[PDB]
């Protein structure tokens, strides 16, 4: 028969990243061990994970072993299953939870991106990472920024794992700056490691007027087109990169609100999914990576 479970799982030592079990083997079931298997479990965990060990190998005779590739500052419990050549055992009781040492950040966040803001300032943005790399207490993130060409980093600590924006000021700067930024981690046992590298621009003047000429019609019952006029350029407004058009509606089933965005110099869009003989207002606004301008004046129609 397959192997008891085995009995008194307790970590004897742990590190950060490893730990130290021993156990004893469970009865035989007539079928001799050979092998023993380890899982750990943590709260982010989804049930128990099979885990690294050294030796990387244990047999029947082995009762003691080292468990690699921990997370730092991680809540852990440990279990052993029994394995024979003619089946698998019931897993053991779990160890008592503790908590790995912890350590410094070796995951850098993702997506570090940014732009738009205001005329004066730099927008830097990233991925907040997942709670269990964190590592530490007093957890945060150190972003880094430079103009193009400039050498000496500037930089500057964002608190809390969750956070996930930070923006610098400074009047000298001009409208769509370039700048290198990059974003690494830290917490109570240092500085971990950054991200690679990426350019973000200073942000710019919002779009001053409004796009004039809004009309909408409809050909399906599930679509209405909305048009206007696209907007000249004067250095005095801001610069438009597109249009973004909105659309709500007031039926008997729901009242809601669209927002749909189209980009350079088209004047039209198709809007789809919408509902069979209902009516919708549209409205229209220029945007740059500043945000939007002023709203058109709304127009309406009828679905078919």
Request: proline share 7%; glycine share 10%.
């Amino acid at each position: 028969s397959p192997p008891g479970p085995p009995e008194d799982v307790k970590v004897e030592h742990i590190s950060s990243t490893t730990s130290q079990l021993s156990w004893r083997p469970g009865p035989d079931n007539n079928s001799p061990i050979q092998i023993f298997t380890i899982q750990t479990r943590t709260p982010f965990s989804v049930g128990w994970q099979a885990v690294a060990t050294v030796p990387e190998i244990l047999n029947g005779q082995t009762y003691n072993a080292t468990v690699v590739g921990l997370s730092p500052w991680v809540e852990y419990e440990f279990r052993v299953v029994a394995g024979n050549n003619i089946g698998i055992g019931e897993p053991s009781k779990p160890s008592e939870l503790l908590r790995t040492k912890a350590s410094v950040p070796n995951v850098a966040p993702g997506n570090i991106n940014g732009g738009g803001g205001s005329r004066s300032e730099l927008v830097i943005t990233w991925e907040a990472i997942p709670e269990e790399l964190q590592n530490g207490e007093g957890f945060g993130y150190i972003v880094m920024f430079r103009p193009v060409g400039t050498t000496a980093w500037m930089k500057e600590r964002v608190a809390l794992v969750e956070s996930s924006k930070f923006i610098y000021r400074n009047e000298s700067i001009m409208p769509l700056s370039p700048f290198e930024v990059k974003v690494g981690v830290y917490n109570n046992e240092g500085e971990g490691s950054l991200s690679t590298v990426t350019i973000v621009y200073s942000g710019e003047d919002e779009p001053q007027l409004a796009p004039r000429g809004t009309s909408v019609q409809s050909f399906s019952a599930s679509e209405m087109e909305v048009s206007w006029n696209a907007i000249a350029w004067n250095r005095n407004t801001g610069r438009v990169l597109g249009y973004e058009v909105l659309y709500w509606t007031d039926n008997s089933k729901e009242s809601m609100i669209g927002k749909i965005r189209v980009s350079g110099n088209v004047t039209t869009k198709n809007i789809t999914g919408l509902r069979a003989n209902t009516i919708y207002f549209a409205s229209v606004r220029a945007y740059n990576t500043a945000g939007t301008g002023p709203s058109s004046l709304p127009v309406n129609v009828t679905t078919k």
